[PDB]
């Protein structure tokens, strides 16, 4: 949980208008649009193994509602989303390749992000 009320910042606007937008448009992003539905997907022990679920739809909603105080918290949510995927799933699963491809784009956009955070 954040330690301060959220803000609008140059870095958070970049996460919303560059990072989320570029990831969402790829045809392999769809498994990350919504929380993992472990009932419909019949995923045994998903919530026993994954204690902090996260998805890109939740991240997008948090950005639009100014939930985050800093883009560092948003980047951690993306990291949680990818790490959960690798922890729960099997090496040869389709989902792992899809996460790897999205995570590479995520890191590329983080490398290109403005390095200081200023409130808007």
């Amino acid at each position: 949980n954040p330690s301060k009320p959220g803000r609008k910042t140059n870095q958070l606007q970049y996460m919303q208008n560059v990072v989320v937008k570029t990831l969402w448009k790829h045809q392999f992003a769809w498994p990350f649009y919504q929380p993992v539905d472990a009932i419909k997907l019949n995923l045994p022990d998903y919530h026993k193994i994954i204690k902090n679920p996260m998805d890109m739809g939740t991240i997008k909603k948090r950005l639009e509602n100014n939930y985050y105080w800093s883009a560092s918290e948003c980047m951690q949510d993306f990291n949680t989303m990818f790490t959960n995927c690798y922890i729960y799933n099997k090496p040869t699963d389709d989902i792992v390749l899809m996460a790897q491809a999205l995570e590479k784009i995520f890191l590329q956009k983080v490398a290109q992000m403005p390095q200081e955070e200023v409130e808007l």
Partner: peptide, 11 residues
């Protein structure tokens, strides 16, 4: 969508 969830997609 999934043929087998997480393992193999159908789309």
């Amino acid at each position: 969508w999934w043929i087998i969830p997480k393992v193999k997609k159908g789309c």
